[PDB]
Amino acid sequence: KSEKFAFQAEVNRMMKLIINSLYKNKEIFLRELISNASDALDKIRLISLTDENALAGNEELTVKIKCDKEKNLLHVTDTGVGMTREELVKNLGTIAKSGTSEFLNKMTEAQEDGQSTSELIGQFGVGFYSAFLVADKVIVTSKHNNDTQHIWESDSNEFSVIADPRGNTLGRGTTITLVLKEEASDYLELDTIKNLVKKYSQFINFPIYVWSSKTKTVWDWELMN
Numbered sequence: 001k002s003e004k005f006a007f008q009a010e011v012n013r014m015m016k017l018i019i020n021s022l023y024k025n026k027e028i029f030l031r032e033l034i035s036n037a038s039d040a041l042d043k044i045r046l047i048s049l050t051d052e053n054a055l056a057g058n059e060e061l062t063v064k065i066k067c068d069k070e071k072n073l074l075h076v077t078d079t080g081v082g083m084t085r086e087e088l089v090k091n092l093g094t095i096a097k098s099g100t101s102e103f104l105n106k107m108t109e110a111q112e113d114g115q116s117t118s119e120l121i122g123q124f125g126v127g128f129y130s131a132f133l134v135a136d137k138v139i140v141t142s143k144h145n146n147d148t149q150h151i152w153e154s155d156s157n158e159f160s161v162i163a164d165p166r167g168n169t170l171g172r173g174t175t176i177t178l179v180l181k182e183e184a185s186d187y188l189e190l191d192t193i194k195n196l197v198k199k200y201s202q203f204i205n206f207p208i209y210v211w212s213s214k215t216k217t218v219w220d221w222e223l224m225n
């Protein structure tokens with residue numbers, strides 16, 4: 001079943017531009033993943049204004065983050081609109097999305113004339129690739145109302161997509177899972193991530209939770225808002 005794909009040339013070049021742009025600010029990857037989740041949440045919310053059964057698969061609209069230090073994984077899950085198999089292949093593997101080409105051009109000039117590019121990335125919502133600053137592997141599990149649950153996975157040298165054998169566990173939404181580099185083990189620490197989630201979510205119109213503990217050990221979603 002597992003079908004392999006090569007990234008489109010432009011995306012390879014875009015990945016490199018993005019990476020070298022935030023290379024001294026690796027922490028910004030989290031802000032972009034949260035921003036992406038926010039976008040996905042706004043889409044499903046707008047769709048709910050028309051489609052009455054829009055939220056059936058998952059009546060909540062949240063962003064939930066969890067550190068799995070023991071597995072060296074960081075997970076960013078949203079109950080947003082999700083992506084069908086085709087959207088996983090197209091949105092992550094190519095520049096087809098309308099204004100992505102515009103970003104490639106502006107981001108290239110800006111970077112040339114010493115202008116800030118940090119805002120461009122957030123502006124055109126192409127911050128997903130900054131995950132490769134702290135991850136050796138990025139896995140995107142997604143469930144869209146019009147398709148079954150799939151998994152996209154990449155080490156940046158190519159990518160695969162397979163139907164998720166685990167069935168439909170998300171309900172609706174997306175999970176970005178990062179297999180962190182050694183140099184980034186820090187992002188496995190609750191205190192660190194929790195701090196980042198707050199410094200980058202105070203402007204999100206959706207509730208943002210981090211799976212934290214007290215310590216007898218109590219585990220539950222802590223609202224960072």
Ligand SMILES: Nc1nc(Cl)nc2c1ncn2[C@H]1CC[C@@H](CO)O1
Nearest residue numbers: 036037040081082083091126128174
């Ligand atoms: N979390 C995401 N949810 C949805 Cl529905 N789409 C996403 C998400 N993260 C990334 N994408 C899509 C939109 C931008 C594109 C390239 O980063 O991939």
